[PDB]
Amino acid sequence: SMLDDAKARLRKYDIGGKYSHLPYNKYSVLLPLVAKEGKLHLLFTVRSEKLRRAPGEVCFPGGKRDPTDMDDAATALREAQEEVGLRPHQVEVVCCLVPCLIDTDTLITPFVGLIDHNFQAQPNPAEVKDVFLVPLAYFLHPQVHDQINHIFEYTNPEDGVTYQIKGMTANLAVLVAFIILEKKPT
Ligand SMILES: O=C1CC=CN1c1ccccc1-c1cccc(C(F)(F)F)c1
């Protein structure tokens, strides 16, 4: 099926816990896959304007590891729960993709999670100003603006709202799209 096929593809790129004991400042992000209307979508947040890091920016759910987290995946789930109400039984963590090195002292580990069809985002306004889906296929033929560096613009056809997606977030979205959608029959 569509979902089993996605998980089978994602597993081939799983690095596991290989880079997890390294002594960095550690953050995790969840790349949440949602199936609507026969297609895969990614769930994104727009960070609250109030926040320390990256106010107002499109990001995946995630944040800093803390001492309660059993591992790096748990960081991602905890933070996703706090930001959009995603509960443990509503997500299956399928793999750990390549970490992202930032600022010489920081490692951000991304996990891809399959999201239950009955989950409905409950944006927490202290963390998140908005939550939106983008079809995964969009990342194969994005609308690119050069700001010099590359920015994606996605317009939700439901309401005409335009979102700007950039940096690590845009990079990880392209990666997931390539992994799951490359070389597929129609
Ligand atoms: O400034 C940027 C741009 C993209 C990564 N950084 C970060 C840089 C340093 C530390 C953390 C981060 C970060 C910034 C924002 C959300 C997160 C997250 F992991 F919590 F989601 C992590």
CSV table of C-alpha atoms and ligand atoms in Angstrom, one decimal:
chain,number,residue,atom,x,y,z
A,1,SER,CA,0.0,0.0,0.0
A,2,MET,CA,0.9,3.7,0.0
A,3,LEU,CA,1.8,3.7,3.7
A,4,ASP,CA,3.7,0.5,3.8
A,5,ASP,CA,5.6,1.6,0.8
A,6,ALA,CA,6.6,4.8,2.5
A,7,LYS,CA,7.8,3.1,5.6
A,8,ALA,CA,9.8,0.5,3.6
A,9,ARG,CA,11.6,3.4,1.7
A,10,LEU,CA,12.2,5.4,4.9
A,11,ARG,CA,13.8,2.5,6.7
A,12,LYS,CA,16.6,2.2,4.1
A,13,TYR,CA,17.8,5.7,5.2
A,14,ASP,CA,17.6,5.1,8.9
A,15,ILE,CA,20.9,5.9,10.6
A,16,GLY,CA,19.5,4.8,14.1
A,17,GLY,CA,21.3,5.9,17.3
A,18,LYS,CA,24.8,5.9,15.6
A,19,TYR,CA,25.2,9.7,16.2
A,20,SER,CA,23.1,10.0,19.3
A,21,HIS,CA,25.7,9.7,22.2
A,22,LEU,CA,27.9,12.4,20.8
A,23,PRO,CA,28.4,15.3,23.3
A,24,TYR,CA,26.4,18.1,21.5
A,25,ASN,CA,23.7,20.5,22.5
A,26,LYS,CA,20.9,18.2,21.3
A,27,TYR,CA,17.6,19.0,19.6
A,28,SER,CA,15.1,16.7,17.8
A,29,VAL,CA,12.5,17.5,15.2
A,30,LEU,CA,9.6,15.4,14.0
A,31,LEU,CA,8.8,15.3,10.3
A,32,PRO,CA,5.1,14.3,10.5
A,33,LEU,CA,3.6,12.5,7.5
A,34,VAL,CA,-0.2,12.7,7.1
A,35,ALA,CA,-2.2,10.8,4.5
A,36,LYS,CA,-5.2,12.9,3.1
A,37,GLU,CA,-7.0,12.5,-0.2
A,38,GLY,CA,-4.9,9.6,-1.4
A,39,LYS,CA,-1.6,11.5,-1.0
A,40,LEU,CA,1.2,12.1,1.6
A,41,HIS,CA,1.6,15.5,3.2
A,42,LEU,CA,4.0,17.0,5.6
A,43,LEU,CA,2.8,18.9,8.7
A,44,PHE,CA,4.6,22.2,9.5
A,45,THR,CA,4.3,24.8,12.2
A,46,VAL,CA,4.7,28.5,12.2
A,47,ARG,CA,6.6,29.4,15.4
A,48,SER,CA,5.0,32.0,17.7
A,49,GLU,CA,6.3,35.6,17.3
A,50,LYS,CA,7.2,35.5,21.1
A,51,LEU,CA,9.9,32.8,20.9
A,52,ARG,CA,13.6,33.1,21.5
A,53,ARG,CA,14.8,31.1,18.5
A,54,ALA,CA,13.3,31.8,15.1
A,55,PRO,CA,10.1,33.6,15.9
A,56,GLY,CA,7.5,33.6,13.0
A,57,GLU,CA,9.3,31.0,10.9
A,58,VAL,CA,8.1,27.9,9.4
A,59,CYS,CA,9.6,24.9,11.2
A,60,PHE,CA,8.9,21.3,12.0
A,61,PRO,CA,7.8,20.5,15.5
A,62,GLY,CA,10.7,19.8,17.8
A,63,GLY,CA,13.0,21.3,20.4
A,64,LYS,CA,15.7,20.8,22.9
A,65,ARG,CA,16.4,17.5,24.6
A,66,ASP,CA,15.7,17.4,28.3
A,67,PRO,CA,16.6,15.0,31.1
A,68,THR,CA,13.3,13.2,31.0
A,69,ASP,CA,13.7,12.1,27.4
A,70,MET,CA,14.7,8.4,27.2
A,71,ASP,CA,16.3,9.1,23.7
A,72,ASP,CA,16.2,11.5,20.8
A,73,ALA,CA,12.9,10.3,19.4
A,74,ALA,CA,11.3,11.0,22.8
A,75,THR,CA,12.4,14.6,22.6
A,76,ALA,CA,10.7,14.9,19.2
A,77,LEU,CA,7.4,13.4,20.5
A,78,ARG,CA,7.4,15.5,23.7
A,79,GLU,CA,7.8,18.6,21.8
A,80,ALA,CA,5.3,17.7,19.2
A,81,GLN,CA,2.7,17.1,21.9
A,82,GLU,CA,3.4,20.4,23.6
A,83,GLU,CA,3.1,22.3,20.3
A,84,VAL,CA,0.2,20.7,18.5
A,85,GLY,CA,-1.3,18.2,20.9
A,86,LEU,CA,0.0,15.1,19.1
A,87,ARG,CA,-0.2,12.2,21.4
A,88,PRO,CA,2.0,9.1,21.6
A,89,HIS,CA,-0.6,6.6,20.3
A,90,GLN,CA,-1.1,9.0,17.3
A,91,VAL,CA,2.3,8.7,15.9
A,92,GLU,CA,4.6,5.9,14.7
A,93,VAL,CA,8.2,6.8,14.5
A,94,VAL,CA,9.6,5.1,11.5
A,95,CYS,CA,13.2,6.3,11.3
A,96,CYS,CA,15.9,8.6,12.2
A,97,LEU,CA,17.4,10.5,9.3
A,98,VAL,CA,20.8,12.2,9.0
A,99,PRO,CA,21.5,14.7,11.6
A,100,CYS,CA,22.1,18.3,11.0
A,101,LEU,CA,25.2,20.1,12.4
A,102,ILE,CA,24.7,23.7,13.4
A,103,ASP,CA,26.9,26.4,15.1
A,104,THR,CA,29.9,24.1,15.8
A,105,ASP,CA,28.3,22.8,19.1
A,106,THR,CA,24.8,21.6,18.1
A,107,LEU,CA,23.2,18.5,16.6
A,108,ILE,CA,19.6,18.4,15.4
A,109,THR,CA,18.3,14.8,14.8
A,110,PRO,CA,15.2,14.4,12.6
A,111,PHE,CA,12.7,11.6,12.9
A,112,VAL,CA,10.0,10.8,10.4
A,113,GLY,CA,6.6,9.9,12.0
A,114,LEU,CA,3.4,8.5,10.5
A,115,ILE,CA,0.4,10.4,11.8
A,116,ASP,CA,-2.9,8.7,12.6
A,117,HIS,CA,-5.8,9.7,10.4
A,118,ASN,CA,-7.9,10.9,13.4
A,119,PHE,CA,-5.3,13.4,14.7
A,120,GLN,CA,-6.5,17.0,14.5
A,121,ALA,CA,-3.9,19.7,15.4
A,122,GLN,CA,-4.6,21.8,18.5
A,123,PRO,CA,-2.1,24.6,18.0
A,124,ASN,CA,-0.7,25.8,21.3
A,125,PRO,CA,-0.5,29.6,20.9
A,126,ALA,CA,2.4,30.1,23.4
A,127,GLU,CA,4.5,28.0,20.9
A,128,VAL,CA,2.9,28.0,17.6
A,129,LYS,CA,1.0,30.6,15.6
A,130,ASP,CA,-0.2,28.2,12.9
A,131,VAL,CA,-0.1,24.6,11.7
A,132,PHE,CA,-0.5,23.6,8.0
A,133,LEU,CA,0.0,20.7,5.6
A,134,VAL,CA,1.9,20.7,2.3
A,135,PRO,CA,1.6,17.8,-0.1
A,136,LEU,CA,4.8,15.9,-0.2
A,137,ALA,CA,4.9,16.1,-4.1
A,138,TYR,CA,5.2,19.9,-3.9
A,139,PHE,CA,8.9,19.5,-2.8
A,140,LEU,CA,9.7,18.0,-6.2
A,141,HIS,CA,8.4,21.1,-8.1
A,142,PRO,CA,8.5,23.9,-5.6
A,143,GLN,CA,8.0,27.6,-6.3
A,144,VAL,CA,11.5,29.0,-5.6
A,145,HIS,CA,12.2,32.6,-4.7
A,146,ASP,CA,15.9,33.8,-4.2
A,147,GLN,CA,16.0,36.1,-1.1
A,148,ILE,CA,21.6,35.2,-1.9
A,149,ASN,CA,19.7,31.9,-1.0
A,150,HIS,CA,16.7,29.7,-2.0
A,151,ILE,CA,13.2,30.0,-0.4
A,152,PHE,CA,10.1,27.9,-1.2
A,153,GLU,CA,6.6,29.6,-1.4
A,154,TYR,CA,3.6,27.4,-1.0
A,155,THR,CA,0.0,28.7,-1.3
A,156,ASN,CA,-2.7,26.6,0.4
A,157,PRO,CA,-5.5,26.3,-2.3
A,158,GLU,CA,-8.0,26.0,0.6
A,159,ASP,CA,-7.6,29.7,1.6
A,160,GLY,CA,-4.9,31.4,-0.7
A,161,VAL,CA,-2.5,31.8,2.3
A,162,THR,CA,1.1,31.8,1.2
A,163,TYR,CA,3.9,30.3,3.5
A,164,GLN,CA,7.6,30.7,3.1
A,165,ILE,CA,9.7,27.6,3.9
A,166,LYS,CA,13.4,27.8,4.1
A,167,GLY,CA,16.7,26.6,5.6
A,168,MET,CA,17.0,23.3,7.3
A,169,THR,CA,13.2,22.9,7.2
A,170,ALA,CA,13.1,23.2,3.5
A,171,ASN,CA,16.1,20.9,3.1
A,172,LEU,CA,14.6,18.1,5.2
A,173,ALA,CA,11.2,18.3,3.3
A,174,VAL,CA,13.0,17.8,0.0
A,175,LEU,CA,14.9,14.9,1.4
A,176,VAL,CA,11.8,13.1,2.6
A,177,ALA,CA,10.0,13.8,-0.7
A,178,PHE,CA,13.0,12.3,-2.6
A,179,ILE,CA,13.1,9.2,-0.3
A,180,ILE,CA,9.4,8.4,-0.6
A,181,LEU,CA,8.4,9.6,-4.1
A,182,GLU,CA,11.4,8.8,-6.4
A,183,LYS,CA,11.1,6.2,-9.0
A,184,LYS,CA,7.3,5.4,-8.5
A,185,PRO,CA,5.0,3.8,-11.2
A,186,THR,CA,1.7,5.5,-12.0
B,1,LIG,O1,18.2,28.7,14.1
B,1,LIG,C1,17.9,27.6,13.6
B,1,LIG,C2,17.3,27.4,12.2
B,1,LIG,C3,16.9,25.9,12.1
B,1,LIG,C4,17.6,25.3,13.3
B,1,LIG,N1,18.1,26.4,14.2
B,1,LIG,C5,18.7,26.2,15.4
B,1,LIG,C6,20.0,26.7,15.7
B,1,LIG,C7,20.5,26.4,17.0
B,1,LIG,C8,19.8,25.6,17.9
B,1,LIG,C9,18.5,25.2,17.6
B,1,LIG,C10,18.0,25.5,16.4
B,1,LIG,C11,16.6,25.3,16.1
B,1,LIG,C12,15.8,26.4,15.7
B,1,LIG,C13,14.5,26.4,15.7
B,1,LIG,C14,13.8,25.2,16.0
B,1,LIG,C15,14.6,24.1,16.3
B,1,LIG,C16,13.9,22.9,16.7
B,1,LIG,F1,14.7,21.8,16.8
B,1,LIG,F2,13.4,23.0,17.9
B,1,LIG,F3,12.8,22.6,16.0
B,1,LIG,C17,16.0,24.1,16.4
